[PDB]
């Protein structure tokens, strides 16, 4: 609609082609343009979209120079489409030393924050990538505190609590969820929102990619655990206007000893 | 039914009368008898049921001797009805030094485990009771590892993770949830089950008690986050037959630094 809320976000849900960054970044540019036209101020895009979700092939075939070229292209998209952008690429080190990352650029193309996925999923990711060792970043943008996590991270309450403990209000999550795993968006995401009093945005692939059929189901969940908007299984651009004191009450000095 | 599963549990959902332990323990004895008749091996009963959920009045009026008399009565119920029993009373110390507790007695009346609520809810509880300082107990019974938590505890992912980290498979939760707080059983409990791969049982008051209208909604949630059985708002006896590797994958040595 007309702007009702002083923050409008977009999530891109699409299918990537393995090892075809020109194609996949063309898709991200198209979504950035369309989101900007609709008055969105930020676009969230899915995990590893630029090269496809193909961990073993990214480690065998995708060089650090190719990563950097993709990163430069995405910074340029942010700037040229005049929209903040969250993307997810391999990290900048060599193939054997890098992780899976998420980065936020603002509408000027400045990179505000970089995060390396802490919780790798399965043996293919753990062979292809180095896990992150740093907590999620939290930063002011657009009138709220934003944070980043990547896919499997959000399934751990600890990871979302780590962001919320820093002050996060809006947690943005590139993902790549296949296998009709309804429990993640259906059961875990609502709880992550409620148990911290935060909003979460979850941007997935959909369709046939890299040997898997991704679930779609991209969603923005508010602090009551309610979907503010959601997609189905097909490509789409989700645009959402955003409007007990667990964080204080938690006995963190005991909890930390009991994990 | 006929026994299909080698564990059948019962949850008692009822209304307590404030400061009337004879009445409220008579209700627990009745439910224990009925659960035993149906082949249940354990009965779970709600938070503070024996004196009613009236924190300020328990601290002003209920002596340690009166607590101990109630405790003895409940041990006797376990033994005489031949069923394991989970109850929740004030702890055994003076009014100014005790917490809210849960205890498990086996079908012989032996007290297997005692737990003191770590996460107190609201200012009335925090005036009336001392928070616990120990992690949840985990113990073999009936072929599985059982654990105890009390009401608000379960709303913290940390508390359930603390039990699961110890090996819990079945977490038993006396509660006292009023105010049409649908998110706890609806959103948080399913996630606590899924994110640990455990079963949780949640036994609430219902109806008018101590100035509040308790929600009922007692439920047993399986590891998929699915209700194995559930009650509505009225008194009842719920009887249930029980049939990603988050616990391993979690980077607990980082998480503990980030809470």
UniProtKB/TrEMBL annotation, chains A, B:
Coiled coil: none annotated. CDD domains: R-amidase_like (cd07576). Keywords: Hydrolase. Residues 7-243 form the CN hydrolase domain. The modification Cysteine sulfinic acid (-SO2H) is found at residue 59. PROSITE patterns: CN_HYDROLASE. Pfam families: CN_hydrolase. GO terms for biological process: putrescine biosynthetic process from arginine. InterPro entries: Aliph_Amidase/BUP, C-N_Hydrolase, C-N_Hydrolase_sf, RamA-like. It comes from the Bacteria. Its EC number is 3.5.1.4. GO terms for molecular function: amidase activity; N-carbamoylputrescine amidase activity. The keyword Hydrolase applies. PANTHER family: BETA-UREIDOPROPIONASE (PTHR43674:SF2), NITRILASE C965.09-RELATED (PTHR43674). This is Amidase. The lineage of its organism: Bacteria, Bacillati, Actinomycetota, Actinomycetes, Micrococcales. The gene is Nit2.
């Amino acid at each position: 609609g007309l702007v009702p809320s002083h923050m409008r976000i977009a999530l891109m849900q699409h299918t990537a082609r393995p090892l075809d960054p020109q194609h996949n970044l063309d898709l991200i540019d198209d979504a950035a343009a369309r989101a900007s036209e609709q008055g969105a101020q930020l676009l969230l895009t899915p995990e590893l979209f630029g090269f496809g979700y193909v961990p073993s092939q990214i480690c065998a075939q995708v060089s650090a120079e190719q990563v950097d070229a993709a990163r430069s292209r995405l910074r340029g998209i942010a700037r040229d489409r005049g929209i903040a952008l969250v993307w997810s690429l391999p990290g900048p080190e060599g193939p054997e030393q890098r992780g899976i990352t998420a980065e936020l650029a603002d509408e000027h193309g400045e990179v505000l924050a970089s995060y390396q996925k802490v919780q790798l999923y399965g043996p293919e990711e753990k062979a292809a990538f180095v896990p992150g060792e740093q907590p999620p970043p939290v930063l002011s943008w657009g009138g709220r505190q934003l944070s980043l996590l990547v896919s499997y991270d959000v399934e751990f309450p600890e990871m979302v609590r780590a962001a919320a403990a820093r002050g996060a209000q809006l947690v943005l999550v590139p993902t790549a969820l296949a296998g009709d795993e309804t429990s993640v968006p259906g059961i875990l995401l609502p709880a992550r929102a409620v148990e911290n009093g935060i909003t979460l945005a979850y941007a997935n692939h959909c369709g046939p990619e890299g040997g898997l059929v991704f679930d779609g189901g991209s969603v923005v969940v508010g602090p009551a655990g309610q979907p503010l908007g959601e997609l189905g299984v097909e490509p789409g651009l989700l645009v959402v206007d955003l409007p007990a004191d667990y964080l204080q009450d938690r006995r963190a000095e005991l909890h930390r000893n009991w994990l």
